[PDB]
Amino acid sequence: FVVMAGMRKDGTIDFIKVYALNEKLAIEVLEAFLKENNIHPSDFIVIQRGYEKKAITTRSEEELSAMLGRLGLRLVSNGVLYTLYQITAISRELFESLQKEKREIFEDVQEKITFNFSKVDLPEKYVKKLRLLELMEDTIIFNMAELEIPNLLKAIVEGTVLIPRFLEKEDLIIRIFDEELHEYRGSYFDKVLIKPPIIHWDFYLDSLEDFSFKKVEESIYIAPLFLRATGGFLILTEPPEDLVKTLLKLKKRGEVRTILEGKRITIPINFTLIVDTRHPERYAGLKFPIRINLPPLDDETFLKVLETNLGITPPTEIVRIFPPDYKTFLGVELIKNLFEKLKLTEKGKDEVSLLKEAATIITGGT
Amino acid sequence: DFVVMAGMRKDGTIDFIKVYALNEKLAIEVLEAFLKENNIHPSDFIVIQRGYEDVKDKKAITTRSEEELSAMLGRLGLRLVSNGVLYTDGIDKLYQITAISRELFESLQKEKREIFEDVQEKITFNFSKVDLPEKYVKKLRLLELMEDTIIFNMAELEIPNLLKAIVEGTVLIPRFLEKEDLIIRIFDEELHEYRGSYFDKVLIKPPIIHWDFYLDSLEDFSFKKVEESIYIAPLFLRATGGFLILTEPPEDLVKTLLKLKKRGEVRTILEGKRITIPINFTLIVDTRHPERYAGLKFPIRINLPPLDDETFLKVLETNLGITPPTEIVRIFPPDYKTFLGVELIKNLFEKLKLTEKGKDEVSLLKEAATIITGGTP
Secondary structure, rough: EEEEEEEEEOOOOOEEEEEEEHHHHHHHHHHHHHHHHHOHHEEEEEEEEEEEEOOOOOOOOHHHHHHHHHHOEEEEEEEOOOOOEEEEEHHHHHHHHHOOOOOOOOOHOOOOOEOOOHHHOOHHHHHHHHHHHHHHHEEEEEOOOOHHHHHHHHHHOOOOOEEEOOOEEOEEEOOOOOOOOOEEHHHHHHEEEEOEEEEEEEEEOOHHHHOOEEEEEEOOOOOHHHHOOOEEEEEEEEEOOOHHHHHHHHHOOOOEEEEEOOOEEEEEEEOEEEEEOOHHHHHHOOOOOOOEEOOOHHHHHHHHHHHHHHOOOOOOHHHHHHOOOOOOOOHHHHHHHHHHHHHHHEEEEEEEEHHHHHHHHOOOOO | OOOOEEEOOOOEEEEEEEEEOHHHHHHHHHHHHHHHHEEEEOHHEEEEEEEEEEEEOOEOOOHHHHHHHHHHHHHOOOOEEEEOEEEEOOOOEEEEEEEEHHHHHHHHOOOOOOOOOHHHHHHOEHHHHHOOOOOHHHHHHHHHHHEEEEEOOOOOOOOHHHHHHHOOOEEEEEEEEEEEEEEEEEOOOOOOOEEEOOOOEEOOOEEEEEEEOOOOOHHHHHEEEEEEEEEOHHHHHHOOOEEEEEEEEOHHHHHHHHHHHHHHHHHEEEOOEEEEEEOEEEEEEOOOOOOHOOOOOEEEEEOOOOOOHHHHHHHHHHOOOOOOHHHHHHHHOOOHHHHHHHHHHHHHHHHHHHHHOOOOHHHHHHHHHHHOOOOOO
């Protein structure tokens, strides 16, 4: 086991970083270190632990040493290991100072959110319409083209932000950072640097319970979705109108106040809202600054998209054989899959006849 | 009285354990003694299989009698060893327990995932095992593409029986999934055709699952709780690599299933733990009210029309065994000209034949037609 102790100029140790083979050895070493320095364990809160170099010394941990130097702490190594579980802890008052005093110390790392439309293959007349998302405002998208918004935002959005890993409010731990929806980039003690969050909520696939403080263990809670989308995008697919009203009112207020186990908690709100819908009239009484419409594909665009996907040049007549419902992006993907299957099974015949056969199959054989 | 067979590495580390014994208590005591003797902690092993095995065809349990096991371990870089020989004379059922080390389980999960891929067979269709009119086989041949299908079934054909009759092949599926000490069962002893066992996977015939609105419950599409930390996977997870057929389902369920297939995985929360499992199956919707699913896209649509006069006569000749006159087509109710109607007519005709002896079969057919119509003159 190897322990790194970051102390101030007066010798007061405030940062502990223990490395050990397993969890039991790690906790035993941590308790031995706490007792050996007459440090009450109640003064240190664990912020990170888990699994993940010939030797691990001070010269191996250059980035940690630099970050501690930014915080005015010195990095030392008690021993050397020859080649794994690790635990990180900081003192309580240092945590408070990070919360209030040293808040924007690592602001210089946060990049700027940018939209790069060269990473997707889309027509120009739709890129022009979708460029309005750069303003970072609440948007309602009339999606008659059945485009996949979350995939597009995953593809084109670039940048980084910093979010708190968790909130400790009077011995209650509310978890903000989750390893499933957030793309990890780095961890700066109390905060985590990640890519701008993109959260998706589908009415048929998800539950409304996600919008409440869900209990996991005693004194452990998971924050609602709109708190886990801080600094990013929250996309709702066909949501109820009441939920939209509640979210708009919460954004207008600027904070959420809740009661849990007799303790009152207030948390600020900062995110962007996107409503991806095909029935806009359901939200007639609500006001969104940005409205985007995606029309059905016309004949020229349909032919261009088919040529792009299938890899062949379809003729004009095949425009009039497909049903009107299939002239969207999802219909194009289904046509591509069916055409690929037909070409794989039926070898020797030309591709245009395969396209005609696929169109005949799709329409049910009349 | 008992025997233990060990799959061992070259460096002496123990990785695979199998125990044969007479009963459960003897098996577990032998397993615990074996673990304790070689300084092994029970947590490092996970119980993969346990149950009764037939040893009627085996005179004794030796290393030479388990050459398939030896080959399987050799393909994984392990050697099979035994501590002795167990005599199985006069014994048919023997309790067997099979367990592997945790690191081996993880290696099979991630690194050695596709080692046994060569065992599987490609899925093919053999339409010579059923007798149907050719104009219907031509329409039904489109099921070989294995795309999502909607069947407008006005001929009242039994799709699950046809698919169970005309489908050949093999597929490997996991027996269960272990996630944060939770266990989710995938292999189903009632709906799956057992074909072989390969450590943590089971080779079976391509699963075919049927769900009927008026017979089954929607709870089949949720993680059912058997006991603590044990769950049964939903239907679409037990149809991996096969077919899921839905008879008159509600539109919301179809929409949810299509969205789940589009997303590619199912993620949920159980007992404060988050799980995510991939999805891979083929959906068939058998219905007589297609307009209920107008807003959804299905790449393949198959329409089965009611039998006409010539086809009805041909099917009657095929099933009954006699050649009826043409006038027969003008006495039966219009809605009876399907396959189910033909089956009912066949059963009634057989019972009338049994009751009345010596009568000509045409008169028996006319009498059955009169009985069906309620005796209206």
